[PDB]
Write an enzyme that holds these catalytic residues in place. Structure first.
Site, PDB file in Angstrom:
ATOM      1  N   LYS A 142       0.947  -1.198  -0.031  1.00 41.27           N
ATOM      2  CA  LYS A 142      -0.091   0.161  -0.020  1.00 41.27           C
ATOM      3  C   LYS A 142       0.780   1.090  -0.119  1.00 41.27           C
ATOM      4  O   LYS A 142       1.800   1.283   0.758  1.00 41.27           O
ATOM      5  CB  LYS A 142      -0.935   0.032   1.235  1.00 41.27           C
ATOM      6  CG  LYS A 142      -1.702   1.214   1.506  1.00 41.27           C
ATOM      7  CD  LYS A 142      -2.817   1.572   0.263  1.00 41.27           C
ATOM      8  CE  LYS A 142      -3.172   3.101   0.481  1.00 41.27           C
ATOM      9  NZ  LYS A 142      -4.293   3.131  -0.478  1.00 41.27           N
TER      10      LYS A 142
ATOM     11  N   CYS B  28      -0.810  12.063  -6.453  1.00 41.49           N
ATOM     12  CA  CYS B  28      -0.954  12.522  -5.234  1.00 41.49           C
ATOM     13  C   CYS B  28      -0.740  14.085  -4.909  1.00 41.49           C
ATOM     14  O   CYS B  28       0.003  14.617  -5.493  1.00 41.49           O
ATOM     15  CB  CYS B  28       0.268  11.724  -4.758  1.00 41.49           C
ATOM     16  SG  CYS B  28       0.606  11.613  -2.786  1.00 41.49           S
TER      17      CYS B  28
END
Ligand code: FMN
Ligand code: FMN
Ligand code: W87
Ligand code: W87
Ligand code: CAC
Ligand code: CAC
Ligand code: CAC
Ligand code: CAC
Lengths: 314, 314
Positions: free
Chosen positions: B45, B132
């Site tokens: 992750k 992001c």
């Protein structure tokens, strides 16, 4: 339920459906077929000052989840679409939008000054296509926000009358904020059509190991089921950001349910591209029946009762 | 005899399949489950320096055509994934990639400085997530080419070893050209994973008239069948523009045929997100069997015989 007629832009519409620009609208035969259909309105193929043949074939392909195209702006040229709007279209039947996609600002400016009088006289409506050819070293106009603000300043000045703008999809909230702020600088921009095709996808056939369209090494804009959540996000993002404009939804409509979702997200008109190309103009009676059935089941009697009323959680 | 084996980045992979970052990889239980599966590799992750709870639920939903998420980067923190890479992972089973997604350049630099010695000693591979936020109100990092260049300059200097980058999809040929140019400035960027989710879609449920995830008024990244042509286009666009790098494909893989298409487009590894979230880790034996069956039918014995060999028309 009962009937789907609505009023927008100082025109009356029997229902919110129309074709998406480029589908069933290039020739006089196509425009007469869209006029004979049960659609609420029609829009012409985006045009350039001169006629164009467009790209080599195959240049459109469809699949169960949608379509890919690199048409290359084939069109009969502005003089033809202006003549259709000024002499041939039957305005008793439904409103007409004319889409223009000149290759430069100056080309667009020259077309719009010629459209103005026919807009004033006949009520044709302008949809300005803020998509463009690839120019190495430069993004399409609606993805360059200072360029977009230029086009729109010049077109607003040259045209001088209410018009709308066909937008590509965006995928970033900062871009929704910047793009909507540009559009809100122009009071003549009275509708925003969200969205054009999702740019530069690539469909490959496994058996042949080949791309399926000839231009651009197989890359082309995506439509259809692939793009419905993208289209709904763009419709709702501009609906929330542009309270003094209308938003027209386009992308992924195959059913009255899909049209209901666009309207919940904020759409005033709902445009049908891929599904209309694949099914033909009979689709409009089916979409209208299906939308009225979902409205009846829910107790809605008008589009206004649920337009933009998508619910958020908490 | 046919073979799915690959040897890349100084590692040996039994087959090209791995999870997509974020799916089945947040906890030690998840990582051990991916390790026990038939995949050729796994990635953790995306992490931040400090643990995060992520966004309120519901934050992921799936449907027949794919998924939507706004997870909010929930993760156990860097120290946990570095410990798993250093001390817990069984490298004799398969290679491990660690995804990092700091919320500033400095957070990324701090993580990669500490990852470097475990990368060197244990051979864990870095995937830097560039899809992001940096400054809120600005685009995500990989849609801001100047921010992207700064992140890659800073991480290359701090880390000093081969790494790869996870890219969002692009939709404009000018953006493919600019983005690949930025990547090609960095020789330590040895692989490029295309694509992250298609940003800021909106799924609406017709019966409830509601968006289906709670964060961001329902807006979230799209995966699954919606995005396969977009993914293939990005894989092939970077494969053509970055001849000295590997491309890993991600997006819309549910079958060995979808994997074959990615590989035709240029993919080395093939990551599986939505379909793995929905089906579970048994998917990997089905994808291996399905890819081998297509290779057998076509006479292909290794992946190199067809990687990047998609045919164009004319
Ligand atoms: C064959 C074809 C030609 C198109 N030509 C144009 C066009 O001339 N002008 C334009 O604004 N959009 C054009 N588009 C985009 C469509 O208007 C529409 O925005 C897109 O296909 C998404 O809607 P859909 O999912 O219903 O197909 C074209 C689409 C297709 C499939
Ligand atoms: C639940 C969820 C969590 C994800 N988290 C991350 C992540 O931490 N880091 C990342 O690079 N991508 C993340 N992604 C994106 C996936 O890695 C993948 O790029 C995207 O889902 C497209 O692949 P697919 O079509 O196979 O789902 C996530 C996707 C999902 C569905
Ligand atoms: C390879 O050269 C081209 O494709 C090309 C060349 C010159 C002008 C172009 C102009 C365009 C503009 C596209 C405008 C019309 C349009 C088209 C279309 O006509 O291709 N397809 C869409 O999905 N949306 C659209 O808005 C696209 C490609 C070219
Ligand atoms: C409500 O505000 C947010 O969504 C948010 C807030 C603070 C940090 C965030 C950070 C992210 C970063 C995304 C990085 C991980 C990721 C995710 C994820 O964890 O959401 N989902 C993806 O489809 N792809 C990804 O690469 C997204 C949203 C937020
Ligand atoms: C119906 As046609 C071939 O003019 O879009
Ligand atoms: C909101 As109700 C009256 O449409 O059941
Ligand atoms: C399987 As899980 C909730 O740790 O992604
Ligand atoms: C010959 As090569 C795969 O390094 O471009």
């Amino acid at each position: 339920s009962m009937c789907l007629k609505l009023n927008l832009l100082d025109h009356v519409f029997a229902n919110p459906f129309m074709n998406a620009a480029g589908v069933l609208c290039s020739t006089e035969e196509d425009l007469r077929c869209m006029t004979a259909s049960s659609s609420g309105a029609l829009v012409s193929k985006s045009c350039t000052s001169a006629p164009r043949d467009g790209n080599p074939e195959p240049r459109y392909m469809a699949f169960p989840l949608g379509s890919i195209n690199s048409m290359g702006l084939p069109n009969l040229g502005f003089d033809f679409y202006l003549k259709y709007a000024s002499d041939l279209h039957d305005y008793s039947k439904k409103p007409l939008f004319l889409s223009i996609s000149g290759l430069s600002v100056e080309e667009n400016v020259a077309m719009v000054r010629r459209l103005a009088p026919v807009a004033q006289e006949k009520g044709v409506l302008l949809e300005l296509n803020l998509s463009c050819p690839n120019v190495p070293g430069k993004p399409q106009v609606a993805y360059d926000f200072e360029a977009m603000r230029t086009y729109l300043q010049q077109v607003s000045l040259a045209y001088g009358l209410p018009f709308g703008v066909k937008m590509p999809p965006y995928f970033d909230i900062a871009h929704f904020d910047t793009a909507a702020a540009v559009l809100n600088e122009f009071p003549l921009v009275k509708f925003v059509t969200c969205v054009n095709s999702v740019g530069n996808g690539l469909v490959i056939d496994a058996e042949s190991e080949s791309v399926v369209i000839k231009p651009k090494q197989g890359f082309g804009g995506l439509g259809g089921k692939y793009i419905l959540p993208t289209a709904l996000a763009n419709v709702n993002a501009f609906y929330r950001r542009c309270p003094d404009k209308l938003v027209f939804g386009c992308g992924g409509v195959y059913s009255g349910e899909d049209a209901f979702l666009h309207i919940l997200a904020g759409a005033s008109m709902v445009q049908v591209g891929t599904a209309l190309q694949e099914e033909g103009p009979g689709i409009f009676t089916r979409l209208e029946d299906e939308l009225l059935e979902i409205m009846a089941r829910k107790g809605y009697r008008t589009l206004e009762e649920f337009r933009g009323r998508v619910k958020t959680i908490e």
